[PDB]
UniProtKB/Swiss-Prot annotation, chain B:
Subcellular location: Cell membrane; Melanosome
Assigned protein family: Belongs to the peptidase M28 family. M28B subfamily.
Disease: Immunodeficiency 46: An autosomal recessive primary immunodeficiency disorder characterized by early-onset chronic diarrhea, recurrent infections, hypo- or agammaglobulinemia, normal lymphocyte counts, intermittent neutropenia, and intermittent thrombocytopenia.
Function summary: Cellular uptake of iron occurs via receptor-mediated endocytosis of ligand-occupied transferrin receptor into specialized endosomes. Endosomal acidification leads to iron release. The apotransferrin-receptor complex is then recycled to the cell surface with a return to neutral pH and the concomitant loss of affinity of apotransferrin for its receptor. Transferrin receptor is necessary for development of erythrocytes and the nervous system. A second ligand, the hereditary hemochromatosis protein HFE, competes for binding with transferrin for an overlapping C-terminal binding site. (Microbial infection) Acts as a receptor for new-world arenaviruses: Guanarito, Junin and Machupo virus.
Other remarks on this protein: Serum transferrin receptor (sTfR) is used as a means of detecting erythropoietin (EPO) misuse by athletes and as a diagnostic test for anemia resulting from a number of conditions including rheumatoid arthritis, pregnancy, irritable bowel syndrome and in HIV patients.
Name of protein: Transferrin receptor protein 1
Annotated source species: Homo sapiens (Human)
Induction entry: Regulated by cellular iron levels through binding of the iron regulatory proteins, IRP1 and IRP2, to iron-responsive elements in the 3'-UTR. Up-regulated upon mitogenic stimulation.
Post-translational modification: Stearoylated by ZDHHC6 which inhibits TFRC-mediated activation of the JNK pathway and promotes mitochondrial fragmentation. Stearoylation does not affect iron uptake.
Gene: TFRC
The protein's assembly and partners: Homodimer; disulfide-linked. Binds one transferrin or HFE molecule per subunit. Binds the HLA class II histocompatibility antigen, DR1. Interacts with SH3BP3. Interacts with STEAP3; facilitates TFRC endocytosis in erythroid precursor cells. Interacts with GRM2. (Microbial infection) Interacts with Guanarito, Junin and Machupo arenavirus glycoprotein complex.
């Protein structure tokens, strides 16, 4: 959104609605706040207890919208999908520990919402093969993490240029 | 969802969906090549979905 | 092989009021067929005898004078002939010095100069057709029957005229033009995609021009076929039918004049549909024999896109270098793997700050080597997930119709180029991963040598103690 190719496609569609002889064709633009990748990489990287030798797993090509700019260490604990039923079915205590979940059956934002209510620090989301059968194991993806909808930095009122933000 | 729940407009959505959900849907491999590999007859199905929205 | 067009005469022009259409087939108007229908109407009334004397002089003047006037506009047809033939081929434009955008403007000026010739030499004859039509009205005034007029000739002329309707084929023209127009819009959509990859400017201008003329002939085909189907629909719509035993004289004149004009539309339609049918099939075969010069200039573009756009020659070098780095590190531990066993047996009875350095560095060395082997496995896994993609495009380029007739094979080749275009992001990010893991193999490559230096310092200090 907001890229140049979006605006070229919008000029193409807005040309088509003129060429098909619609009764009236109109455009409506407004300014929003999204989140995009930084020029520095974000990584997930195994730390030994010694603090001496440091091993890395991936520089993920895909990112999550509306996350926080941070960096943390700690224990990792598997959770099924991040249902609230899952977190209350677990044996290991959740708090103070990064979690991993599998994508599917719930929006990303409710996974992060439940893992935030149980006081965890980190969330890593992946795709297993059983729910998602594919061949290419080195593949990345995308999701918004905002619970609720709309541009979050203007809730309730619209994001035009009359609000002065 | 914001038409139904926030505004109060009756909203409707539909899909011809296989039992397991579509694998590469928010993905860098979502493209027309692998799409026509999954669905071998895309023209007829798109004809059906446009027919339903026409009704 | 045929690279030229012999018959050009599909050009036509209509009046400013759009009332009359001129054609380059004889009898060059629709109204002569109406007049030949009005002979067969005048044979059934004994009142109108003078039509057979007047209309011979009138329509003989019209046919001789009309064919004369086209004989005046022959000379511009010869120049537009040479201009189509020179502008259309690559060899004739190759022997012609002027540029293509230069010569196409000459094509426009000679084109509407030609159609301007034809209309400007029939301007008088349209007024002539008005005058003869007024004479048909005047002779139809002379009918004796004032108020109760049959309507016995009319219902039968719909029958004999309906036999002339059942003679003509209609279905083949409709199915033909729908299939053909589908192939046309597929072709025009195809050239826009094909003119971005391939170098040559000449053949691509030939194909763009021939698709322009092809579009004109498709338009005239739709027009004349539309008037034929509307004429048949109105006449058979009158064959339900309303059945008066008697009508007014001017009502009867409105009837015979009415469906007589429908005979003029139909009989004027059949030969025009024949000529345009020949035109679309011929121009179609010209376009196919133009794409036959293009596919060989496209195949090398596929065989140039594969090897450079799947990043294979660079990635194989990365895996080769990291492999040689692993053999270097395991070579050094192959060198001193006994020397660790010399430097474990001594110190365990003394001032042990020194094991805190030693088993530190030994665990660092072991876990570093295992880290490098896991790195090599990750990079080769990425490589397999790239070469699977390249192999799949090779399997799509191997299987082709042979047995591909016509232009479908060039659409297969363009679909393979799109099949290399739809898969760029996966290979890009995958190759970026290969770069990352190689960088960190460099970092462990310097770290392992610092470790071996620390092991040597351990050895000489154990020798000191
Ligand atoms: C609407 O608001 C936007 C957001 O500030 C304005 O766009 C910016 O204008 C400033 C100064 O003209 C420049 O930094 C850029 O042109 C815009 N910034 C970005 C990040 O896009 C815009 O000018 C406002 N519209 C009006 C009419 O004032
Ligand atoms: C929260 O996490 C810490 C981790 O050190 C743990 O010791 C503690 O018991 C947890 N809180 C509760 C209430 O269990
Ligand atoms: Ca808002």
């Amino acid at each position: 959104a907001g890229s140049q190719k979006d605006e070229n496609l919008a000029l193409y569609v807005e040309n088509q609605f003129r060429e098909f002889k619609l009764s009236k064709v109109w455009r409506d633009q407004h300014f929003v706040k999204i989140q995009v990748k930084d020029s520095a990489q974000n990584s997930v990287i195994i730390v030994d207890k010694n603090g001496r030798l440091v091993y890395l797993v991936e520089n993920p090509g895909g990112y999550v919208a509306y996350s926080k700019a941070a960096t943390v260490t700690g224990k990792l604990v598997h959770a099924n999908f991040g249902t609230k039923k899952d977190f209350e079915d677990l044996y290991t205590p959740v708090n103070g520990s990064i979690v991993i979940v599998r994508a599917g059956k719930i929006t990303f934002a409710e996974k992060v919402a439940n893992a935030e209510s149980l006081n965890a620090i980190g969330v890593l989301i992946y795709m297993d093969q059983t729910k998602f059968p594919i061949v290419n194991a080195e593949l990345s993806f995308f999701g918004h993490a905002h619970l609720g909808t709309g541009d979050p930095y203007t809730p309730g009122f619209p994001s035009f240029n009359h609000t002065q933000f | 969802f914001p038409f139904l729940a926030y505004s109060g407009i009756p909203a409707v959505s539909f899909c011809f969906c296989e039992d397991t959900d579509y694998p590469y849907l928010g993905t860098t491999m979502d493209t027309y090549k692998e799409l026509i590999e999954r669905i071998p007859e895309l023209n007829k199905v798109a004809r059906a979905a446009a027919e339903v929205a026409g009704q | 092989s045929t690279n030229t067009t012999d018959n050009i005469d599909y050009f036509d022009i209509s009046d400013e009021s759009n009332y009359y259409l001129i054609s380059q087939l004889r009898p060059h108007f629709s109204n002569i067929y109406f007049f030949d229908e009005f002979k067969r109407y005048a044979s059934y009334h004994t009142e109108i005898k003078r039509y057979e004397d007047i209309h011979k002089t009138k329509v003989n003047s019209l046919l001789n004078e009309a064919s004369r006037a086209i004989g005046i506009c022959n000379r511009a047809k010869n120049t537009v002939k040479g201009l189509i033939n020179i502008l259309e081929n690559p060899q004739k434009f190759k022997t012609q010095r002027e540029s293509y955008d230069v010569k196409l403007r000459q094509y426009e000026e000679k084109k509407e100069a030609f159609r301007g010739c034809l209309l400007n030499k029939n301007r008088k004859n349209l007024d002539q057709i008005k005058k003869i039509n007024n004479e048909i009205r005047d002779l139809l005034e002379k009918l004796k029957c004032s108020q109760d007029c049959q309507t016995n000739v009319y219902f039968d002329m719909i029958k004999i005229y309906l036999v002339d309707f059942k003679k003509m084929p209609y279905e083949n023209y409709d199915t033909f033009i729908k299939q053909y127009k589908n192939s046309y819009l597929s072709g025009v959509d195809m050239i826009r995609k094909i003119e971005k990859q391939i170098d040559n400017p000449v053949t691509i201008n030939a194909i763009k021009f021939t698709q322009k003329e092809m579009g004109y002939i498709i338009d005239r085909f739709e027009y004349h076929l539309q008037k034929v189907k509307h004429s048949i629909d109105q006449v058979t719509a009158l064959s339900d039918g309303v059945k008066p035993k008697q009508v007014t004289k001017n009502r009867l004149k409105e009837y015979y004049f009415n469906i007589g004009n429908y005979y003029s539309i139909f009989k004027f339609g059949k030969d025009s549909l024949n000529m345009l049918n020949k035109a679309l099939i011929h121009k179609e075969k010209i376009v196919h024999n133009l794409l036959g010069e293009l596919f060989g200039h496209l195949e090398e573009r596929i065989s140039k896109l594969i090897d450079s756009e799947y990043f294979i020659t660079e990635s194989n070098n990365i895996i080769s270098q990291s492999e040689e780095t692993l053999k270097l590190a395991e070579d050094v531990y192959d060198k001193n793997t006994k020397l660790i066993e010399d430097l474990t047996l001594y110190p365990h009875l003394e001032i042990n700050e020194f094991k805190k350095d030693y088993d530190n560095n030994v665990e660092d060395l072991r876990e570093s080597i295992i880290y490098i082997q896991s790195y090599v496995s990750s990079i080769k896994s990425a490589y397999r997930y790239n070469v699977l993609e390249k192999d799949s495009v090779e399997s799509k380029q191997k299987n082709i119709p042979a047995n591909s007739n016509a232009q479908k094979k060039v659409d297969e080749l363009l679909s393979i180029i799109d099949s290399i275009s739809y898969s760029n992001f996966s290979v890009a990010e995958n190759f970026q991963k290969m770069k990352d893991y190689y960088k960190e193999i460099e970092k462990l490559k310097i770290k392992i040598l610092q470790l071996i230096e620390a092991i040597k310092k351990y050895q000489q200090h154990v020798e000191e103690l």
